[PDB]
A paper describes a structure:
The structural observation suggests that Ile34 may not be a major contributor to the affinity of DNA binding by TALE repeats, consistent with the classification of NI as a “weak” TALE code. It also insinuates that base A may “tolerate” a wide range of amino acids at position 34 of a TALE repeat when there is no steric clash. To test this speculation, we generated dHax3 variants with the 34th residue on repeat 7 substituted with different amino acids. In total, we obtained nine high-quality structures that elucidate the accommodation of base A by Leu, Met, Cys, Pro, Trp, His, Thr, Asn, and Glu at the 34th position. Among these, the hydrophobic residues Leu, Met, Cys, and Pro all adopt conformations that do not clash with base A. As what happens to Ile34, there is no specific coordination found between these hydrophobic residues and base A. Trp, Thr, and His, in spite of the presence of polar groups, do not form H-bond with base A. They also appear to adopt conformations that simply avoid steric clash. These residues may all represent weak code, if they are used for base recognition.
Transcription activator-like (TAL) effectors specifically bind to double stranded (ds) DNA through a central domain of tandem repeats. Each TAL effector (TALE) repeat comprises 33–35 amino acids and recognizes one specific DNA base through a highly variable residue at a fixed position in the repeat. The crystal structures of TAL effector (TALE) proteins bound to their respective target DNAs have revealed that the residue at position 13 is the only one directly involved in DNA base recognition, whereas the 12th residue stabilizes the proper loop conformation. dHax3, an engineered TALE protein, proved to be a useful scaffold for structural characterizations.
Author numbering: 231 to 721
DNA sequence: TGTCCCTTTATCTCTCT
DNA sequence: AGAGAGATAAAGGGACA
């Protein structure tokens, strides 16, 4: 027999029951736990399904799936029920914070290390709990917390970094690695190649920070002199997500992409300066000619699509969907290029293809409106949220379709829509804001927190802001959102 | 294996002027 | 409003007891 067969049966036997109360997963959630948490994790969720759900912890079935779907999930589940009260009463953290900490590989380690080092890290090191929680909310949070305790002094004193910078570096997977590598390489990178600490913090403050630092050190000379890249251009590549892989891939494919396709170095850097840059570059090398065939998408359009995170996914999805969307949906190549030219372009194109019919026929939008919603980062989310919420917003809340589309046509459009639908009645009914004003506020990136800031001030007012009228607060929130209100508060 | 740690890639959301 | 920045997730590999 295949030996993993008994272990697969256990999974299903137990998985079956979990669809019932008090959790009741939906296969998606169940599949997820199995893949990452594995068999012992699916069994642990079952075993502790009652202890977690209701009193005393009262975790939503959502948070339970978040804690369980990682390596050592079972251990995290046992530790949360043991340490969530300790952490929520002895340190003043919220359950949301405890869950965020639990929800990573080795979460048991992170929760225990937080319980053990938070006092020392706030008292003797002057860190907030927020910062402690942030450091702890990544795989190996335990290692990062311990490395922060050990190296905060030398990093601020001998090397001149602020605590904020140290926290920023530590708050990624492999935090301990990035920290140790910054200690050794900060003088080397600053004094030998003339980088500022700030640039060095930016290179270190991503997952694989250690790898990006050492790769900058190694390849900077070769990049700046052989290829004519500026130091500034190298940093941009190393600090934007491609990291080590994008750097190594720039050295390889800069000449190839320039000579053979007439791309400028400026355009190549922009493709590389994203998450999965390596992947975007190699995909462009392969795909540019296929896309710009028979007068197809121009080079410039191909670069534009490529120059976003997951740009590889975007390029491939265009090649697949450019014909079907242009023909069977009546979209100009220009419109398809628009929707694909953002982070998650693949997701948006796919969602346009799926919902463009439904949004026009069932909700009476134009293609141009569906394109506008989709043509932002997270466009898939904005599209799905418009489909769900268009009726309750228009019918129950009074908004026009044009207004609902307006709120949706920005990064975070989904957050902006859910938050409007949530807070419109108290904003209008309880504090006298007009709908048009609420729509104005939420029709910008950062729509959600701007609206939350406003409601927070109208319901537990700060004297710091009381000299301002409702109309002023609105004018301010449209101008600069939560940041503009936070600033004014500090004055 | 189960658990812990690290690295790359993709997606989503908010900031900054 | 595009560019910059940063949180969160999925998925794979090393390591080890």
């Amino acid at each position: 027999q295949w030996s993993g067969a008994r272990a697969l049966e256990a999974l299903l036997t137990v998985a079956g029951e979990l669809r019932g109360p008090p959790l009741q997963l939906d296969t998606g959630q169940l599949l997820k736990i199995a893949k990452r948490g594995g068999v012992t994790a699916v069994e642990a969720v079952h075993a502790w399904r009652n202890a977690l759900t209701g009193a005393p912890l009262n975790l939503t079935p959502e948070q339970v799936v978040a804690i369980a779907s990682h390596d050592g999930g079972k251990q995290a589940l046992e530790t949360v029920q043991r340490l969530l009260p300790v952490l929520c009463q002895a340190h003043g953290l919220t359950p949301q914070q405890v869950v965020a900490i639990a929800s990573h590989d080795g979460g048991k380690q992170a929760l225990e290390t937080v319980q053990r080092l938070l006092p020392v890290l706030c008292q003797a090191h002057g860190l907030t709990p927020e910062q402690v929680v942030a450091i702890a909310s990544h795989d190996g949070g335990k290692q990062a917390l311990e490395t922060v305790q050990a190296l905060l002094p030398v990093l601020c004193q001998a090397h001149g970094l602020t605590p904020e910078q140290v926290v920023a570096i530590a708050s990624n997977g492999g935090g301990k690695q990035a920290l140790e590598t910054v200690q050794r390489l900060l003088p080397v990178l600053c004094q030998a190649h003339g980088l500022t600490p700030q640039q060095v913090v930016a290179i270190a403050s991503n997952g694989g920070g250690k790898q990006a630092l050492e790769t900058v050190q190694r390849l900077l000379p070769v990049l700046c002199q052989a290829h004519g890249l500026t130091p500034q251009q190298v940093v941009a590549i190393a600090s934007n997500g491609g990291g080590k892989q994008a750097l190594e891939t720039v050295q390889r494919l800069l000449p190839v992409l320039c000579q053979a396709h007439g791309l400028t170095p400026q355009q190549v850097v922009a493709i590389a300066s994203n998450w999965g840059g390596k992947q975007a570059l190699e995909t462009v090398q392969r795909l540019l000619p296929v896309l710009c065939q028979a007068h197809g998408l121009t080079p410039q359009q191909v670069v534009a699509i490529a120059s976003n995170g997951g740009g590889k996914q975007a390029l491939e999805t265009v090649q697949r969907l450019l014909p079907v969307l242009c023909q069977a949906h009546g979209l100009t190549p220009q419109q398809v290029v628009a929707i694909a030219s953002h982070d998650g372009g693949k997701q948006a194109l796919e969602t346009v293809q799926r919902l463009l019919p439904v949004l026009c026929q069932a909700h009476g939008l134009t293609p141009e409106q569906v394109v506008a919603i989709a043509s932002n980062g997270g466009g898939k989310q904005a599209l799905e949220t418009v489909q769900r919420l268009l009726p309750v917003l228009c019918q129950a809340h009074g908004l026009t379709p044009e207004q609902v589309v307006a709120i949706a046509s920005h990064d975070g459009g989904k957050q902006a829509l859910e938050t409007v639908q949530r807070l419109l009645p108290v904003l209008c009914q309880a504090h006298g804001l007009t709908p048009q004003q609420v729509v104005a506020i939420a029709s910008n990136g950062g729509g959600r927190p701007a609206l939350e800031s406003i409601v927070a001030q109208l319901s537990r007012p700060d004297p710091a802001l009381a000299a301002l009228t409702n109309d002023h607060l609105v004018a301010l929130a449209c101008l600069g959102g939560r940041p503009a209100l936070d600033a004014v508060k500090k004055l």
